[PDB]
Amino acid sequence: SDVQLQESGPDLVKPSQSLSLTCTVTGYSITSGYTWHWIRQFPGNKQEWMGYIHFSGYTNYNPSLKSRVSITRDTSKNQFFLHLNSVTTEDTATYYCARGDYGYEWFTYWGQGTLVTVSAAKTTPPSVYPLAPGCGDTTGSSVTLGCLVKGYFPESVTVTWNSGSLSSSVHTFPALLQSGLYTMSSSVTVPSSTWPSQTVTCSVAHPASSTTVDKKLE
Amino acid sequence: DIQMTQSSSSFSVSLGDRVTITCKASEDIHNRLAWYKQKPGNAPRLLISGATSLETGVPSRFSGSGSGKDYTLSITSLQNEDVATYYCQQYWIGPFTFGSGTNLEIKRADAAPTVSIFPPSSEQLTSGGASVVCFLNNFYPKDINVKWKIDGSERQNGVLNSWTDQDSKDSTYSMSSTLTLTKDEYERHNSYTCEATHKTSTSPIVKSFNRNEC
Amino acid sequence: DIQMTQSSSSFSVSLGDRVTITCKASEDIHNRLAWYKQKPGNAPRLLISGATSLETGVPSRFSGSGSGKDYTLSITSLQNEDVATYYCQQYWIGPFTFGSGTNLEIK
Amino acid sequence: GADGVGNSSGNWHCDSTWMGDRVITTSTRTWALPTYNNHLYKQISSQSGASNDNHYFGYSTPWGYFDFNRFHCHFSPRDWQRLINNNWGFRPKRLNFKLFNIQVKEVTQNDGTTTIANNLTSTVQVFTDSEYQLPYVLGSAHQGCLPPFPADVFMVPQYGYLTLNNGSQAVGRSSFYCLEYFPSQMLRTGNNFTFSYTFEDVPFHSSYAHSQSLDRLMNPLIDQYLYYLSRTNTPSGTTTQSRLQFSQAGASDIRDQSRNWLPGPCYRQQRVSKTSADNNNSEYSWTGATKYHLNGRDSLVNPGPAMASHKDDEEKFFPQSGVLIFGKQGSEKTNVDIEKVMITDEEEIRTTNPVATEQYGSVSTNLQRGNRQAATADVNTQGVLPGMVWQDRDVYLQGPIWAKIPHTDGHFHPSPLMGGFGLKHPPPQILIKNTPVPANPSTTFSAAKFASFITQYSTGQVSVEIEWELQKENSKRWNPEIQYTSNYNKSVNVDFTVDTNGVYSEPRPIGTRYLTRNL
Amino acid sequence: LMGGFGLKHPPPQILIKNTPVPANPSTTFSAAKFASFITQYSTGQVSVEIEWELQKENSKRWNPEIQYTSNYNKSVNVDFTVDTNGVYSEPRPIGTRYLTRNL
């Protein structure tokens, strides 16, 4: 899998509100060629094509979305924008901007994508708990530690590890919803000779609530 | 709208094998069909356009064929980079529509899980909660089972199990299992155990700790 | 009489999932078909009429489509209120006839 | 006409030729026809509750009809342009119609699998209501006429009509016409149905705009000789003392000049502006719109009597229901946003008919006297008056072409209000149905109505050619007239063309008045 | 320039299409463009005959002119023939100038 282009915008939006996203392009000019499109993916998996804006500035939209979508451009900035009004929960998805080699074919370059969640559900920051060994034996060659990130709502948190060892094994477990809230975890394995001895810390960021919590292990 | 249907929803394959994916359209697309590749946590990338033309920089292993309603994407010898989900897209008419996608998991040998149990933190107990966790790392095949036993008796309620996507390098899977109880209930017992049952053995890998050991 | 047959007799689903129910008529109804929802111990309620028109006050999650012999009812994201049995009804000709019903157990 | 199975019942005629005085627009298109109401006539009515202004009672029939009451079913951009650019006016003269190459198919939905095949024998029957004994539907701006673009295949509309009603229910006088009670002609394949018509002396649609205007019409250079009332009172040292003096209207005086004719009539409309801002915020869509009412149901007054849509410098405005509005190819059915439609503009008239949004004039109210100031009041509705003169709503390529003059004890100047040609006996309604096909009957007799027929539909092409007359230009106007042109500058798509996905589309509405004649 | 005869009004373009066949329409009316047709194609033969005029030779050239011949020697395949799997093939391009006229 791979590409270029970057989207930016708010992670959270309240329902009846309008969603506004920006796509900044580098290495190419919005004018002079190609149509720039917007596509979204619901968390399940499918891709849906929202609409596009031509180099000339002409736009075409998906008929489903047409009534509440508007795509515009700022040539000076080399950015194109998406505006979706009357957002609903169904609107939650990852939004991508993409270039279309035009004329005969389609989307040559895609952005990273930005996840947008539509919820009033209330935005809730996670509770981060350190996962340190619970047993009656000292570790062998290496040790596994972790961090539980529980009860947060708008999806997408980022767990970053900091350890003594310049070599580690990290596992980020996919977030799952239960009773209207998300919970996720992450684990790290490091040489036993480097943990109790050298500090390991997990940093959890939840952009939606402007939070970041660091938890030192032990 | 033209509807595109993709054949196998998922395939597992290893580096070197040949894989074929199919896409059929509700109506004659006239070869205005493109194929995209999407890695987990990543955006899609254009492999082929015009049904058979490879995009620049795409390796020769990829090829596409088809006409009318039915098209196919073939990968001669799978490469590690190849793991991803593939989507077909029609640009015959607006609106452009995509297929459901086919997930290709490329990654292997059976591997028993490395299991670890973790008691509730002081921070959570302070707030009145109590979550015990068990990590089952680097195993294969994917199917696995975790049984929670409080003082020897199973516990079915309050469980969250999350599997990771197949590892892009070693092709193994990991799973996190959390058993949440209230601090009140938690302090009503001593031994907490999770039993991991997997293909790699008849006897489950068992881990546990006693609540009065500290 | 025109006979209506409904597809899945029963479905289990949870809040948030999408469900689709089908109804086919012995003869061409010409979109004179309505969908009703019935909770246990409760009477039926009108969701859609004219095959695709939502009744007032019905949430947008519900939608209907179809023509001729075959029609379908879809619920985009199930809600707790959604648990119930759904029946299709034809009013092309008398006597009006109902489908067997599909029981949706949400939880 | 008649023949065999492997024989084309007609060729494809789709030309357009100009003869200097006439011009014939031939045109053929492929069509398809399902079986409606599953072969039965169904009674239909408003929805019990529904606002009174919206009740009705009538029937829908298994019959489908044909229609081309849209100029673009005959003119092609280019062509239209030719016409519209060099002709003081034009009108239709005669026509010829023909259906042919009819073919009847029969679908088979066996389980999860349909399979269409030829039902050679079975027929489609056609019949033209040449005696106007059927509720004339055409002319009602319905949509299901011919595709502007040839290459487009289309579906035939279904015939339905309306009678009297006392709310959602019927009233006796209301009649129920049955389409089988006519002598349909039955076609099988290798069969064609031709028929021809001749229009009746009607007036050439005025396809020109006026250079002079009622008010500014006399000669500047010379003052009249008739006098008018210049002043009433007069300076008496400090105070005025009433003393009426008169003047002889001249150029400077103009507004005061004596004349000979009056602007067309009017029926005031609310003004709305293309600029969201200006417009008062609320729902006066119905409440504020100009209407009229019969038997207690207020109906809307769309295509108001022909009257200019905005004064000088206000192309931004328009009547609430004083103009014609078409959708931009694609535009959905309801509550679509301003950006999805094309609004017609009738400034061209200003010169003779009043402005839709502004009152006709202002008549005096009271009778003044020393102890009583002179009254006056503006008039928002002026019915025809002697000496009035005016112009009818222009036409527009994709607009109606004609309409049937209702059979009444009295009409007044019948140019259809939606614009077009007002015909007493318009092109007769053409109907078509597929003689039913009783699917397998039971061995033992039953006198019930047959209800199980073979599922099947028809198709085949249709052709319509019409001869129009023209009135060529003829002005000694030195300086260039205005003409309709297409933009020079590059564009991603040509106007009146198929996009990238082959979807033909009319960019703008094209009127008819470009050439300039004096008043 | 590509060679040939330059014609003011050359043989008119001949076109051919298959009048569409709307596959099964819905009972209830819709004014949309028809999009579901019967899948089908056509076939049949075509014939073209043309009359060409000629200007015959006429030189007092004594010695033999050059002519276009086919190689005498044996070959696995005849030129302008179908191979073993019936695939006709033109071996070489054949010009037109062989006969020799003086300038």
Contact B34, B89 (CB under 8 A): yes
Contact B17, B78 (CB under 8 A): yes
User: Which position has the token pair 């009649």?
Assistant: D175
Label the pairing between strands D239-248 and D227-236. antiparallel
Which of A113, A174, A189 comes nearest B164 by C-beta? A174
Q: Where are the beta strands (DSSP E) in A14-139?
A: 19-24, 35-41, 47-53, 59-61, 69-74, 79-84, 93-100, 107-110, 114-118, 127-131
D384 and chain C: CB distance < 8 Å anywhere? no
D492 and chain A: CB distance < 8 Å anywhere? yes
Tell me how far apart the alpha carbons of residues D186 and D435 are, in angstroms, rounded to a whole number.
8
Q: Which residues of B touch A60 (CB under 8 A)?
A: 94
C69 and chain D: CB distance < 8 Å anywhere? yes
Dihedral angle sign, alpha carbons of residues D237, D242, D247, D250: positive
User: Which position has the token pair 């004649």?
Assistant: D517
Dihedral angle sign, alpha carbons of residues D413, D418, D423, D429: negative
The helix or strand, by DSSP H or E, that contains position D83, with its residue range, turns out to be: helix D77-85
Q: Do E26 and D38 touch (CB under 8 A)?
A: no
Contact B87, B98 (CB under 8 A): yes
E36 and chain B: CB distance < 8 Å anywhere? yes
Tell me how far apart the alpha carbons of residues D27 and D13 are, in angstroms, rounded to a whole number.
6
Contact A215, A202 (CB under 8 A): yes
Residue D171, both tokens: 């009233």
3-state secondary structure of D53: helix
**Minimal Cα–Cα distance from A66 to chain D, Å?**
10
Separation of first and last alpha carbons in chain A? 39
Half-sphere exposure at residue D251, Cβ-oriented, CA atoms within 13 angstroms: 4
- Chain A residues 62-101 with a CB less than 8 Å from chain C: 88-90
B143 and chain E: CB distance < 8 Å anywhere? no
B8-26 in b/e form (b: 16+ CB < 10 A) is eeebbbeeeeebebbbbbe
How many Å is the Cα radius of gyration of chain D?
Answer: 29
Q: Which residues of A touch D330 (CB under 8 A)?
A: 63
Q: Do D38 and C69 touch (CB under 8 A)?
A: no
Residue D395, both tokens: 């036409």
C-to-D residue pairs, Cβ atoms closer than 8 angstroms:
9
Q: Which residue of A has its CA nearest to B9?
A: A45
Label the pairing between strands B53-54 and B44-49. antiparallel
Tell me how far apart the alpha carbons of residues D305 and D414 are, in angstroms, rounded to a whole number.
11
- Cis bond upstream, residue B95 (ω within 30): yes
Tell me how far apart the alpha carbons of residues D119 and D113 are, in angstroms, rounded to a whole number.
19
Residue D191, both tokens: 């069969």
Give C69-90 as a 3 state SS string. Answer: CEEEEEECCCCHHHCEEEEEEE
Contact D373, D327 (CB under 8 A): no
The helix or strand, by DSSP H or E, that contains position A13, with its residue range, turns out to be: strand A12-13
**Minimal Cα–Cα distance from D105 to chain A, Å?**
33
Contact B180, B128 (CB under 8 A): no
Tell me how far apart the alpha carbons of residues B166 and B40 are, in angstroms, rounded to a whole number.
10
Q: Which residue of C has its CA nearest to A44?
A: C17
Tell me how far apart the alpha carbons of residues C16 and C48 are, in angstroms, rounded to a whole number.
20
Contact C45, C89 (CB under 8 A): no
Tell me how far apart the alpha carbons of residues A52 and A97 are, in angstroms, rounded to a whole number.
9
User: Structurally, how many domains does chain D consist of?
Assistant: 1
Contact A99, A34 (CB under 8 A): yes
Non-local CB neighbours of D478 within 8 Å, separated by 6+ positions:
none
**Minimal Cα–Cα distance from B178 to chain A, Å?**
9
Tell me how far apart the alpha carbons of residues C32 and D44 are, in angstroms, rounded to a whole number.
13
Residue type, C55: E
Residue B65, both tokens: 């064929």
Residue type, D279: N
User: Which position has the token pair 């004014």?
Assistant: E31
Contact A35, A53 (CB under 8 A): yes
Which of D35, D143, D459 comes nearest E27 by C-beta? D35
What is the CATH number for D327? Answer: 2.170.30.10
- Nearest Cα neighbor of E37 from E53, E26, E21, E50 is E21
The whole domain housing D15 covers 1-519
Give D98-133 as a 3 state SS string. Answer: EEEEEEEEECCCCCCCCCCEECCCCCEEEEECCCCC
The helix or strand, by DSSP H or E, that contains position D431, with its residue range, turns out to be: strand D430-434
What are the backbone dihedrals phi and psi of residue A50, each rounded to the nearest 5 degrees, phi first? -80, -45
Q: Do D452 and C28 touch (CB under 8 A)?
A: no
Partners of B191 in the β-ladder: B210
What are the backbone dihedrals phi and psi of residue D256, each rounded to the nearest 5 degrees, phi first? -85, -10
Q: Which residues of D touch E26 (CB under 8 A)?
A: 34
Experimental determination approach used: cryo-EM
Half-sphere exposure at residue D363, Cβ-oriented, CA atoms within 13 angstroms: 7
B1 and chain D: CB distance < 8 Å anywhere? no
**Minimal Cα–Cα distance from C105 to chain E, Å?**
34
Contact D136, D426 (CB under 8 A): yes
Do chains D and E touch by CB distance (3+ pairs < 8 Å)? Answer: yes
Centre a 10 Å sphere on the Cβ of residue D176 and count the other Cβ atoms it contains. 11
User: Which position has the token pair 């897209």?
Assistant: B89
Contact B185, B144 (CB under 8 A): no
Tell me how far apart the alpha carbons of residues D260 and D254 are, in angstroms, rounded to a whole number.
14
The helix or strand, by DSSP H or E, that contains position D78, with its residue range, turns out to be: helix D77-85
Cα–Cα separations (whole angstroms), residue D420 to A205, B75, D131, D267: 69, 64, 22, 20
The 8 Å CB, 24+ separation contacts for D164-168 are D164/D57, D165/D45, D165/D46, D165/D55, D165/D56, D165/D57, D165/D58, D167/D46, D167/D52, D167/D55, D168/D45, D168/D46, D168/D47, D168/D48, D168/D50, D168/D55, D168/D56, D168/D57
- Nearest Cα neighbor of D304 from D284, D325, D334, D283 is D325
Q: Do B162 and A176 touch (CB under 8 A)?
A: yes
Q: Where are the beta strands (DSSP E) in D289-417?
A: 291-294, 297-300, 317-319, 325-327, 341-343, 361-363, 377-379, 381-382, 402-404
Contact B75, B22 (CB under 8 A): no
Residue type, D415: S
What are the backbone dihedrals phi and psi of residue A62, each rounded to the nearest 5 degrees, phi first? -65, 140
Label the pairing between strands D402-404 and D421-423. parallel
Tell me how far apart the alpha carbons of residues D417 and D431 are, in angstroms, rounded to a whole number.
26
3-state secondary structure of D63: strand
D51 and chain C: CB distance < 8 Å anywhere? no
Partners of D115 in the β-ladder: none
Residue type, D136: Y
Residue D169 per-residue DSSP state: B
- Chain D residues 294-333 with a CB less than 8 Å from chain A: 330, 332
Do chains A and B touch by CB distance (3+ pairs < 8 Å)? Answer: yes
- Cis bond upstream, residue D414 (ω within 30): no
Residue type, C46: L
B95 and chain D: CB distance < 8 Å anywhere? no
D2 burial level (CB within 10 Å; 0-12, 13-18, 19+): exposed
3-state secondary structure of B205: strand
What are the backbone dihedrals phi and psi of residue A208, each rounded to the nearest 5 degrees, phi first? -55, -30
DSSP character string of B145-199: EEEEEETTEEE-SSEEEEEPPPPTTT--EEEEEEEEEEHHHHTT-SEEEEEEE-T
- Nearest Cα neighbor of D328 from D320, D314, D338, D318 is D338
Q: Which residues of D touch E22 (CB under 8 A)?
A: 30, 32, 153, 459
3-state secondary structure of B107: coil
Cα–Cα separations (whole angstroms), residue D417 to D394, D405, D414: 10, 11, 8
Half-sphere exposure at residue B76, Cβ-oriented, CA atoms within 13 angstroms: 7
Cα–Cα separations (whole angstroms), residue C41 to C84, D453, E56: 10, 41, 105
Q: Which residue of E has its CA nearest to D29?
A: E19
- Nearest Cα neighbor of B75 from B51, B104, B117 is B104
- Nearest Cα neighbor of D422 from D397, D392, D398 is D392
Non-local CB neighbours of D25 within 8 Å, separated by 6+ positions:
D16, D74, D75, D79, D465, D466, D468
Non-local CB neighbours of D378 within 8 Å, separated by 6+ positions:
D359, D361, D362
Cα–Cα separations (whole angstroms), residue D100 to D139, D271, D462, E37, E51: 25, 49, 6, 19, 38
Tell me how far apart the alpha carbons of residues D76 and D19 are, in angstroms, rounded to a whole number.
17
Tell me how far apart the alpha carbons of residues D280 and D370 are, in angstroms, rounded to a whole number.
43
Q: Do A67 and D337 touch (CB under 8 A)?
A: yes
Contact C56, C11 (CB under 8 A): no
- Nearest Cα neighbor of C87 from C42, C50, C33, C41 is C33
Q: Which residues of C touch D37 (CB under 8 A)?
A: 30
E43 and chain D: CB distance < 8 Å anywhere? no
Dihedral angle sign, alpha carbons of residues D157, E26, B68, D103: negative
**Minimal Cα–Cα distance from E28 to chain C, Å?**
6
Tell me how far apart the alpha carbons of residues E50 and E72 are, in angstroms, rounded to a whole number.
33
Tell me how far apart the alpha carbons of residues D412 and D464 are, in angstroms, rounded to a whole number.
31
Contact C89, C99 (CB under 8 A): yes
Tell me how far apart the alpha carbons of residues B120 and B130 are, in angstroms, rounded to a whole number.
5
Q: Which residues of C touch E27 (CB under 8 A)?
A: 28, 30, 67-68
For testing the chain B interface, which of D493, D498, D500 should be mutated: the one with the most B CBs within 10 Å? Answer: D500
How many Å is the Cα radius of gyration of chain C?
Answer: 13
Contact A147, A186 (CB under 8 A): yes
C-to-E residue pairs, Cβ atoms closer than 8 angstroms:
9
E24 and chain C: CB distance < 8 Å anywhere? no
Residue type, A56: S
**Minimal Cα–Cα distance from D159 to chain E, Å?**
11
Non-local CB neighbours of B111 within 8 Å, separated by 6+ positions:
B138, B139, B140, B172, B200
Contact D247, D227 (CB under 8 A): yes
Q: Which residues of D touch A66 (CB under 8 A)?
A: 332
**Minimal Cα–Cα distance from A56 to chain D, Å?**
7
Tell me how far apart the alpha carbons of residues D417 and B81 are, in angstroms, rounded to a whole number.
69
Helical spans, DSSP H, in chain A: none
The helix or strand, by DSSP H or E, that contains position B123, with its residue range, turns out to be: helix B122-126
